[PDB]
Paper text:
Dimethylsulfoxonium propionate (DMSOP) is a recently identified and abundant marine organosulfur compound with roles in oxidative stress protection, global carbon and sulfur cycling and, as shown here, potentially in osmotolerance. Microbial DMSOP cleavage yields dimethyl sulfoxide, a ubiquitous marine metabolite, and acrylate, but the enzymes responsible, and their environmental importance, were unknown. Here we report DMSOP cleavage mechanisms in diverse heterotrophic bacteria, fungi and phototrophic algae not previously known to have this activity, and highlight the unappreciated importance of this process in marine sediment environments. These diverse organisms, including Roseobacter, SAR11 bacteria and Emiliania huxleyi, utilized their dimethylsulfoniopropionate lyase ‘Ddd’ or ‘Alma’ enzymes to cleave DMSOP via similar catalytic mechanisms to those for dimethylsulfoniopropionate. Like dddY, cloned dddL, dddQ, dddW, dddK and dddU conferred DMSOP lyase activity even with equimolar DMSP present, which was not surprising considering the similar structures of DMSP and DMSOP, and that these DMSP lyases have cupin domains and similar catalytic mechanisms.
Cloned dddY from A. faecalis and Acinetobacter bereziniae conferred DMSOP lyase activity to E. coli (424.2 ± 20.6 and 359.4 ± 18.0 pmol DMSO per mg protein per minute, respectively) and purified DddY proteins yielded DMSO and acrylate from DMSOP. In contrast, DddY, DddX, DddP, DddL and Alma were more efficient (3–13.3-fold) using DMSP than DMSOP, whereas DddK, DddQ and DddU were more efficient (2–83.4-fold) with DMSOP. Note, DddP, DddX, DddY and Alma proteins generated 1.4–5-fold more DMS than DMSO when incubated with equimolar DMSP and DMSOP levels, consistent with them having significant DMSOP lyase activity but preferring DMSP as a substrate. We also solved the crystal structure of the DddY–DMSOP complex and docked DMSOP into DddQ and DddP structures.
Residue numbers in the entry:
A (entry chain A), B (entry chain B): 22 to 401
The structure:
């Protein structure tokens, strides 16, 4: 195969010792991507040829969850094809890999000195620390950011990978990877993202994709849409409803402490539980989960049975960690392997549904509050 | 100096070709022993006159590791004294060396044909192969033994000796030594030794000592206690707690792939973490590491910082390779330079702590399981 790297991949030269740190980063990245391929292709449930993914937590006509075998989607097929080419010619793909030590586009972080201490690679990369970031921010956002990042190892180690992975892909099994990838406080600066705790208590990182460590633009003339990484959301937080053009996959790693520790919702934009109105090149979708109506839209997540979910384009989705033992546990949360399949086409912006009532209660947004989602059409 | 060999050292005539093969073995043995001497005597840490050794991974009064400058121990001073005499008059000491080609006391092995082929000496010695030994045994012990011995060179080559050794003592630098010494599956036939994978996945060999290639009984009327060799323990294994009369020294060669790949515990018999009751001519020591209490007793091992440990008489110890990247790595383990200092006095038996109850299973013992150690007094 012929790899064309992204345009911000630059020639690099390392000392003998530095190259060992980069090679360990690369090797664990390759394990992550081989396990990712196996997670897609290994059959589960009643699917004969690939993994059974939840595509709607609540189908309006059936009143139950809806699944699909994940390799039925052409975009997922292409992700698998590109991972296979990467893994078959790793020396070629590695031309497109760098540790993002001097990445200028935007800041990338490491949670804490403790996390940094997990690997010589992470100490050498020397990203700014999120403990420093949230000390400067202060307030309730800073308190949530400190709770997550000062306890990041413990939160992210509460995982069970034994059923759907043949190698531990968590921070315990791949500590150089998790300690060295660029972590991003994606909601800390966004007032529309809801509560102070959710904004300070959310992080994600990208191993592979247009902004990750492995940045391949094309393989054999095909645009690489794969964007793979991880996410971490502190316990006792709720987020507003989300939607976006790119299709998205989540594999839950967290071993819950109670059955309803981690709940999630995904429903297609044209689901009859919502009200739709055509708009200039899009849809206005009204969501009304008031008076307990929201509860049936949310399903419990775990790393064995309800572990895999696939979001079609503009599907409405949310992650909810307020119920049950979230009111008593400590240093806990929701931790996933995350991906998007079409990162190089359409609009990648993560959109948030807004209060039907207005910016005023934007901070107290939960799944029971009536919301409005302004969807845009995508290009075929 | 005057050397008196052990009683099973016999005179043997060699052809010119055989003597050459014996000589190469002896020459690498002398390098191994000279490096051993330097590892004891070269100051490290805050020790001014000799190497800083860990003697307790967890002191109960301080809650921290405890160290000692290793030449403060009179038995270590005597190993150093006797190594110096060997190195000063190697022709005299060579009278007590033989390749154990026809050693009668018990079987000695070579891991595999591949390892055997690493040196003309080992091909000539023609030990029985552990690949053959474990094919016959079969089952889960045999599967572990084959995994270790089919991949012996890869496992034992994952070493970094640059910091504390001036010549590489690993298989990569002394291939005749490592391929020719007699390897022993010390736990393969011991039903008390714990899991089937630990039992098949353990090996040690003895260069110098009462059962080694160099078998000196006395130097200048002093009994030589020195017993020096190497150990290999396959990854993803744990062993029961150990104890024994002879003092013991471990120098870690494996370069870990995660900071917690290779963990060890050593705590003196009278450590207040345990409960002691005076028994007949000994001490009953009860150990309770349940509910995570064991974790603080175990320290990470590497060849640079926590590379040297010294076990006082009857000190409880264990080596634990279940954590972290042991759930992700392959063809890996823990490899050490091993020694005992008083191999000619008291009871040399390696003792194992047992499960607290009759219902408790040996095949599952891990550091977290309550255990009972029946210690015997030594002769002062
Ligand atoms: C925070 S991420 C990794 O951009 C994905 C968030 C989402 O849209 O679900
Ligand atoms: C003689 S052995 C097989 O090294 C005993 C192992 C130990 O007690 O550390
Ligand atoms: Zn999303
Ligand atoms: Zn021992």
């Amino acid at each position: 195969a012929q790899f064309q790297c992204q345009d911000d991949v630059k020639p690099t030269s390392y000392t003998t010792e530095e190259q060992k740190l980069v090679d360990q980063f690369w090797n664990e990245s390759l394990i992550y991507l081989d396990q990712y391929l196996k997670a897609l292709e290994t059959p589960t449930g009643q699917c004969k040829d690939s993994a059974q993914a939840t595509i709607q937590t609540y189908n309006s006509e059936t009143g139950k969850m809806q699944t699909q075998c994940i390799m039925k989607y052409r975009d997922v097929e292409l992700v698998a094809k590109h991972l296979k080419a990467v893994l078959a010619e790793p020396d070629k793909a590695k031309a497109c890999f760098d540790p993002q030590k001097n990445y200028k586009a935007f800041p990338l972080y490491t949670p804490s000195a403790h996390v940094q201490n997990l690997s010589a690679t992470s100490k050498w990369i020397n990203r700014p620390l999120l403990t420093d970031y949230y000390k400067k921010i202060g307030g309730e956002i800073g308190a949530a950011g400190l709770e997550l990042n000062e306890n990041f190892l413990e939160i992210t180690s509460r995982t069970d990978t034994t059923l759907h992975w043949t190698k531990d892909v968590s921070i315990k099994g791949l500590p150089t990877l998790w300690s060295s990838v660029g972590w991003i406080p994606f909601y800390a600066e966004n007032p529309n993202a809801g509560s102070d705790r959710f904004r300070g208590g959310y992080l994600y990182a990208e191993v592979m994709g247009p902004w990750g460590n492995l940045r391949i633009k094309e393989i054999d003339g095909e645009k690489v849409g794969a964007e793979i990484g991880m996410t971490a959301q502190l316990f006792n937080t709720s987020a507003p409803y989300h939607y976006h053009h790119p299709q998205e996959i989540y594999m839950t790693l967290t071993k819950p402490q109670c059955i309803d520790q981690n709940k999630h919702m995904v429903m297609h934009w044209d689901n009859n539980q919502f009200k739709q109105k055509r708009s200039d090149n899009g849809w206005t979708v009204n969501i009304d989960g008031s008076k307990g109506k929201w509860k049936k839209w949310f399903s419990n997540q775990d790393p064995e049975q309800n572990w895999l979910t696939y979001f079609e384009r503009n599907a409405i989705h949310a992650f909810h960690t307020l119920e049950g033992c979230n009111q008593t546990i400590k240093n806990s949360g929701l931790v996933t392997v995350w991906a998007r399949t079409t990162a190089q086409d359409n609009n990648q912006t993560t959109q948030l549904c807004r209060p039907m009532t207005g910016a005023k209660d934007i901070k107290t947004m939960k799944p029971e509050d009536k919301a409005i989602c302004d969807l845009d059409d995508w290009k075929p």
